[PDB]
Ligand binder design. Structure first.
Ligand SMILES: [Ca+2]
Ligand SMILES: [Ca+2]
Ligand SMILES: [Ca+2]
Ligand SMILES: [Ca+2]
Length: 452
């Protein structure tokens, strides 16, 4: 039976994904990178089969709550109880969950507790002036109390210390769960809100749906700092240490994959739940991974194949940003948030589809241990075992044909059947001679010998 370790997440910025209703396009302007561009909830419903067909088992939507002007991303909330008018109606959103659930797919909403939009009405309500912390910037980022109390980017910082604010937040969190049947929240700006609040928050949402899933965003590349949050009722965290390594390493050839395995060992070290760490190559707050490839003047398609191979075969919960499967280019926000294009070449859509199939099929990729057998200068071999399954992930991130002989690391007299590109490596005298041509990848299941 299904666990969050088994999940593959397709991540969507609602506005930037699929304009499925042309009639809710209010002052949409696709030529202003800070306006609404037209994507909506109808948009997403129409693309459920496309998403599911790729092997994705869950969708994370950027926030859907009514936002003030310029809130095309959803993070400057104006009304916690209202669906953003450009996206749809509440009904449209209930139908979306229904449509995902029909497809066996889970729905995660982005959910914000830290702050309101800049022009939220409460800012004017005299009864609510103690709803907000004193307006101050964050200066010492090493002062965690300052980080929790400051107004990030000048965003009205909610005061969770006030029981009225806390209650309001729990009541909205519980409400969307009881009203729409979502499966989880991706928690924005986790690090700007105090830990004691997450414990209570955690208690409050799971009191309403027992398996309610929480994926927290703690923006930091120190797993020691990120891992603490996991101790406060948050089931999974976004793995920025993974991202920082994966992004850099897979965007150019002849770079060692070894740092990624140390991110693993450190995840085992520091987190209670090392498999429930959301892994990615990019997201809506980062430069597009394709732009890192373009910067290094190297073909982004071949970069993406290697990266996504590792993403889909390593521990954690893969989170592919909409667009990755078309080599969508994009610099810094907002330029990383381009309209999805559905009429491009399908090479990476089919490659991703194979990957998600293999991660579905091969419970060693969702649940197995994770061993580094070999790493030189980008040529890497990993091994993963689960019950009677043993899998071997080979990624040649080097500019040369590589041959690596395994000799005791696998049980002798079998063969490795390459399930990603059709390779075959037969034990010959205990040894497996793994040969990969430059910048290719393979995923092998270890299996009984065959022949003519
Ligand atoms: Ca629309
Ligand atoms: Ca609005
Ligand atoms: Ca705060
Ligand atoms: Ca080495």
């Amino acid at each position: 039976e299904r666990t969050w370790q088994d999940e593959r997440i397709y991540f969507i910025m609602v506005d930037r994904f699929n304009n499925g209703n042309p009639k809710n396009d209010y002052e949409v302007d696709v030529h202003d990178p800070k306006a609404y561009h037209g994507g909506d909830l109808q948009g997403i419903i129409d693309k459920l089969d496309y998403i599911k067909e790729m092997g994705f088992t869950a969708i994370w939507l950027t926030p859907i709550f009514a936002n003030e002007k310029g809130g095309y991303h959803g993070y400057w909330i104006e009304d916690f109880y209202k669906v953003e008018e450009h996206f749809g109606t509440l009904d449209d959103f209930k139908r979306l969950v229904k449509e995902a659930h029909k497809r066996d797919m889970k729905v995660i909403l982005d959910f914000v507790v830290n702050h309101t939009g800049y022009n939220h009405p409460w800012l004017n309500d005299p009864a609510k002036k103690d709803w907000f912390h004193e307006k101050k910037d964050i200066f010492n980022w090493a002062n965690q109390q300052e980080v929790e109390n400051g107004w990030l980017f000048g965003l009205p910082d909610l005061a969770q210390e006030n029981p009225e604010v806390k209650t309001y937040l729990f009541d909205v969190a519980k409400w969307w769960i009881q009203e729409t049947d979502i499966d989880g929240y991706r928690l924005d700006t986790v690090k700007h809100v105090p830990k004691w609040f997450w414990d209570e928050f955690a208690k409050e949402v799971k009191s309403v749906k027992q398996d309610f899933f929480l994926l927290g965003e703690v923006w930091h590349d120190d797993p020691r700092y990120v891992a603490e949050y996991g101790k406060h009722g948050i089931d999974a965290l976004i793995d920025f240490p993974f991202y920082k390594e994966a992004s850099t390493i897979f965007s150019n050839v002849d770079q060692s994959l070894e740092p990624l395995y140390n991110v693993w060992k450190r995840n085992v070290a520091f987190y209670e739940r090392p498999y429930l760490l959301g892994t990615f190559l990019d997201n809506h707050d980062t430069v597009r991974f394709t732009r890192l490839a373009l910067q290094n003047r190297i073909n982004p398609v071949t970069r993406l194949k290697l990266g996504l191979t590792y993403l889909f075969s390593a521990p954690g919960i893969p989170i592919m940003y909409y667009g990755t499967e078309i080599a969508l280019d994009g610099g810094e926000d907002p330029d990383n948030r381009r309209l999805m294009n559905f009429r491009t070449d399908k090479e990476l859509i089919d490659y991703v589809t194979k990957l998600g199939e293999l991660r579905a099929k091969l419970p060693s990729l969702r649940r197995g241990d994770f061993e580094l057998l070999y790493e030189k200068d980008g040529m890497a071999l990993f091994k993963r075992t689960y019950e009677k399954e043993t899998t071997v992930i080979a990624i040649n991130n080097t500019s040369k044909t590589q041959k690596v002989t395994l000799d005791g690391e696998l049980e002798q007299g079998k063969e490795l059947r390459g399930l990603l590109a059709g390779d075959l490596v037969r034990s010959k005298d205990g040894k497996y001679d793994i040969i990969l041509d430059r910048e290719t990848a393979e995923i092998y299941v270890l299996a009984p010998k065959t022949g003519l």
